[PDB]
Curated annotation (Swiss-Prot):
Name of this chain's protein: Serine protease 1
PTM note: Subsequent cleavage after Lys-125 leads to alpha-trypsin. Further cleavage after Lys-170 yields pseudotrypsin. A cleavage may also occur after Arg-99. Not sulfated on tyrosine residue(s).
Broad class of the protein's primary localization: secreted
GO annotation (BP), single: digestion
Amino acid sequence: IVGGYTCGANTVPYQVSLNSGYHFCGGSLINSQWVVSAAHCYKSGIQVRLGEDNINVVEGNEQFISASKSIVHPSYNSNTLNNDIMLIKLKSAASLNSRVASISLPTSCASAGTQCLISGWGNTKSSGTSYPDVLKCLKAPILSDSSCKSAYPGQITSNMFCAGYLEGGKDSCQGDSGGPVVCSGKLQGIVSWGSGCAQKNKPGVYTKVCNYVSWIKQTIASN
Ligand SMILES: [Ca+2]
C-alpha cells in the first residue's frame, strides 16, 4: 500500500496473509473454513496466516492453518487477469474471535464514488521498494467505469473496477494482491493489477466480487 496508514493491530480481522515460506499475497476470510484471494496468487504449499499484524513477529493472536485445497475460478485468464479470483479451503476451521473474523459477501454491486478500505503488507513505495512488517490501510473511492476504461483502454472487463486517485500517490501495490477491498462492510473487490503503483492516471484495478457470489456459494456448498 503506497500512501496509506498503519491500520492498527487486528482492526482488519478478515485480512489474511498467504505464506509459502514468506508472505506473498493477501486474502479475505469469508467464513471459518474459506479464504477468497486472487487467482494470480495461486501457489501450491500455501499456509494461511490469520490474526496477523507484524508478519515478522509472533505477537500472540495468530492462527497458522495450512490450505487443504485451492480452487482458481474456472474462467480465470492469467493474460488479461479476467476472473482473477480463487478460493482457498483451510485444513481445519479457524477459531473466530475479536481479532479473527469473517467478512460478508455482497448482495449488490458497489456504487462509483463509494469509499472503500484496501489493506495489505505490500510495497509502500511508487518508485523503489520498501515492505512494511505491519498491516497498512488505504481508503480509496471506486472510479466510474468510463474513467477506468479510459485509464486502461482495451483492458477492462465487466469483472473489474478501478479505485484510487488519478493524480497518483495513493494505491495498492505488489504484495497486496489478493487482499480485500471492503465497501459498506462487504467484500466488493480483490487487489488484482495496475500499471506500476500510485502513478498518475493509472489507478488500481480490482476483481469485482459481486459477480462471483453464486460461484463462491455453490463451490463452498460442494467442497
Ligand atoms: Ca505476527
